[model samples]
Target: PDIENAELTPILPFLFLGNEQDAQDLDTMQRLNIGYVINVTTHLPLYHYEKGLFNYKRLPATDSNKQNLRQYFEEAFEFIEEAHQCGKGLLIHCQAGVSRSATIVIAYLMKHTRMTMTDAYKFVKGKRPIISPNLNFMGQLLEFEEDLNNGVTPRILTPKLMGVETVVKEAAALEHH
Candidate 1:
């Protein structure tokens, strides 16, 4: 897929995923009326189009599960939720729109929509088909699901990409979600 030509992909009416370039494209964002940006990447400079026109939040995150993404989940969720509450558009991006950004977006869906991990993954993937959260992040999401369900094990199913119905173990499945 030509990702270079790929800019922001909208998941919800108020949410989007993209790469560094999409976040940096102030003109397009301005035209689209995007009011907020959550940078899920590490070291990507915060994007600011105009003082009054845009709100930017930088949560320097890594793509690996080695990083504890739970640390940023609350803040990222708040940013996205606040934008949604205020009827503002939010664009979230990482180095690429595939992993870190996608993880956060899926987490937001699970948090705010009362969706299970599997359901949230499907919903987000439906919006941006290229999402592939690392195994560690998937583990964190499973933990988050457990926490959300009050200790109940959420029904975790492998996405269709995995070819057959199977369980994603403590490690990654054969295919990416």
Candidate 2:
């Protein structure tokens, strides 16, 4: 695997997406003036959890199709909102800064800006071309879009609800109701 250093991509004026390597670089963060950090993985070390140099929040999850990454969307959004309100930059990162963290950022954009899932995905992808949230996470995001528009909680899917199949089934079900 290419565990090389990846550049931090700013998704919004106050929000950035990056990998673990970027998180470990305190000098870069200090230069960027990012005061809040959200670590979106289970095993990544919390580099400055107690340093008082930056506020930190960790949403423990693995970048697996089966992981319920969507469940933490609200919490993540709230933290991002706090950072924005405080006028401090925030970084959201997982091991590779590709899947889990990207998914969270997308969800936050959808809820915070009232954007459709497609638009949010496009916006985030445009900012960070490397983002590719796993299939299930994409499905959850689609469900989240519906939730935002309809004011309903997204239903949980069984392990069988894989990628495009989940999207197709959701479309069909929506048409009937």
Candidate 3:
């Protein structure tokens, strides 16, 4: 997929998921009335933070599975909550807006809406079909779901066994396309 030209996908009424290019498009943000931006990449600079035109939160995270993204879920949730309280739009983006930012948004939905990991992930995936968080992030989200459910058994399969074949098939189909 050509992520550079991808448009923002609205995950909620005021929450959007997108790539770095979408985040840098100030005119588009203004058009969407977005006032908060969350950058979930390690190298992307704060494009307009100094301008003070919009609230910005940079989450330095790598796309690799080795990176522990779970550590920032609460912080991201709090920032998103702030945007909701302010009645403004928030955009969460990473380099490709596929792994890091998607995982963060899924985590926020899980905690904020009290949704199970599978349901939260499905909800976000429904909004943005391209999202595929790393295996480690999926495992962490499973753990988070258990914690949120007070150690209740997770209702979904292990991350390694969940949707692996389907993703491979989807990738192959994309190649054919």
Regions of model 3 farther than 4 Å from truth: 2-4, 151-177
Q: What are the TM-scores, per candidate, against the unseen true structure? A: 0.78, 0.82, 0.81
Q: How far off is residue 37 in model 3, in Å?
A: 0.7
What lDDT does candidate 3 reach at residue 22? 88
lDDT of 3 by residue, 30-137 (tens): 898999999998899877788789988888999887988878887787788788777788999998888899999888766655556777687778768888999988
- C-alpha local distance difference test of each model: 0.75, 0.79, 0.79
Could you give me the TM-score of model 3 versus the true structure?
A: 0.81
Sequence-dependent TM-score of model 1: 0.78
Evaluated at residue 141, the lDDT of candidate 3 is 86
Off by over 4 Å in 1: 1-5, 49-52, 151-177
For model 2, residues 150-176, the per-residue Cα lDDT tens digits are: 878532233321246534643453344
Candidate 1: tens digits of C-alpha lDDT, residues 76-174? 877876787676888999987888888898887676556668977886776567788999999998888778778453333324112222123211321
Pick out the ten consecutive residues of candidate 1 with the lowest summed lDDT.
161-170
Best-fitting candidate, measured by lDDT?
A: 2
